[PDB]
Amino acid sequence: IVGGYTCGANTVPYQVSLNSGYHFCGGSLINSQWVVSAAHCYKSGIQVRLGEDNINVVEGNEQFISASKSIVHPSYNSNTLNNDIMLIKLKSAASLNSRVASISLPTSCASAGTQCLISGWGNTKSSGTSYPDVLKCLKAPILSDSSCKSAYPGQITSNMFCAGYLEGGKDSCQGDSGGPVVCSGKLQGIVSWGSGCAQKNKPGVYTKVCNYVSWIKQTIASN
């Protein structure tokens, strides 16, 4: 997260870290046995780490659970990142409490101007790499579809939306991919891509979760 602030320990109880001997992507807990992340974060040997704040220190509240299976959307296109979503089923259910909790799926899509909270342990530098130990937060608004298409002509599908600041300075970045974009307590987006991080007129692009609720429910119901 570039230009964000320190969230504060366990203030984002649905945030998870996907770990393969190091933190490589974020995710969101949607029930005690399932996490939603981005399809381009897929790999084998994933360990999901819940109740984390400092990912390099075991401070208490952490729950490390192996993924039993990862389900990448069948229509995911790694060249356009269209349908950049994946579901991960945990080997055992997590114990939910105040520090580890699920986030709700939306019933409707959000409008432009809606303010959202984006969080993650991704890079905090737009020009260089600096990875934090604790979780960073950023409040960002969803931009209009016209501004988003204007910024990324020919690259925005109906399953994506832009959120951020055209002036640059504040944005999500590599390492934050797969993590949550929550607006009014509902998971509206998944960190997916952008051109660099926090560059002027190049806001972040997110997977539009409201377009996948039925797919998510049907897939969880059958697995």
Ligand X SMILES: NC(=[NH2+])c1ccc2[nH]c(-c3cc([C@@H](CC(=O)[O-])C(=O)[O-])cc(Br)c3[O-])nc2c1
- Chain residues binding Ca ion by CB under 5 A are 52, 54, 57, 59
Query: What CA–CA distance (Å, rounded) separates 200 from 65?
Result: 39
CB 65 within 8 A of CB 92: yes
28 binds ligand X (CB under 6 A): no
Q: Is 57 annotated as a binding residue?
A: yes
Number of residues that make up the chain? 223
User: 28, 73, 84, 102: which is the annotated catalytic residue?
Assistant: 84
Sheet holding 160-163, edge to edge: 5-6, 136-141, 115-120, 180-183, 186-193, 204-208, 160-163
List C-alpha distances in Å: 221 to 34, 35, 83, 93, 214. 11, 14, 20, 15, 10
Applying CB under 6 A, does 150 fall inside the site for ligand X?
Answer: no
Nearest to 129 by CA among 41, 197, 202, 60: 197
Told to check if 172 binds ligand X by CB under 6 A, we report yes
Of Cl ion, Ca ion, ligand X, none, which one does residue 185 interact with (CB within 5 to 8 Å by kind)?
none
Closest alpha carbon to 22 in 42, 46, 52, 50: 46
Which one, of 197, 120, 199, lies nearest residue 167 by Cα? 199
Cross-strand partners of 16 = 27
**How buried is 6 (Cβ within 10 angstroms: 0-12 exposed, 13-18 middle, 19+ buried)?**
middle
Catalytic residue among 17, 23, 28, 40: 40
Min separation Cβ 16 and Ca ion, Å: 12
Q: Is 158 annotated as a binding residue?
A: no
Which DSSP symbol is given to 201?
T
Distance CA 3, CA 49 (A): 25
52 is in an annotated binding site: yes
**Is 177 a catalytic site residue?**
yes
Q: Which residue number, 124 or 207, has a Cβ lying nearer to Ca ion?
A: 124
* Binding site partner of 54, from ligand X, Ca ion, Cl ion, none, Cβ cut-off 5-8 A by kind: Ca ion
Residue numbers of the site for Cl ion (CB under 5 A)? 149, 153
Using the minimum distance from each CB to Cl ion, give the nearer residue, 62 or 145. 145
Q: Which one is catalytic: 37, 70, 119, 177?
A: 177
84 binds ligand X (CB under 6 A): no
Which 89-118 residues touch ligand X, going by CB under 6 A? none
Rank residues 100 and 198 by Cβ distance to ligand X and give the closer one.
Answer: 198
Is 174 near ligand X (CB under 6 A)? yes
Q: Candidates 49-57, 81-89, 142-150, 165-173 — which segment interacts with ligand X by CB under 6 A?
A: 165-173
User: Annotated binding site for Ca(2+): which residue ranges?
Assistant: 52, 54, 57, 62
Going by the annotation, the residues of the binding site for substrate are: 171-172, 174-175, 177
Residues labelled catalytic:
40, 84, 177
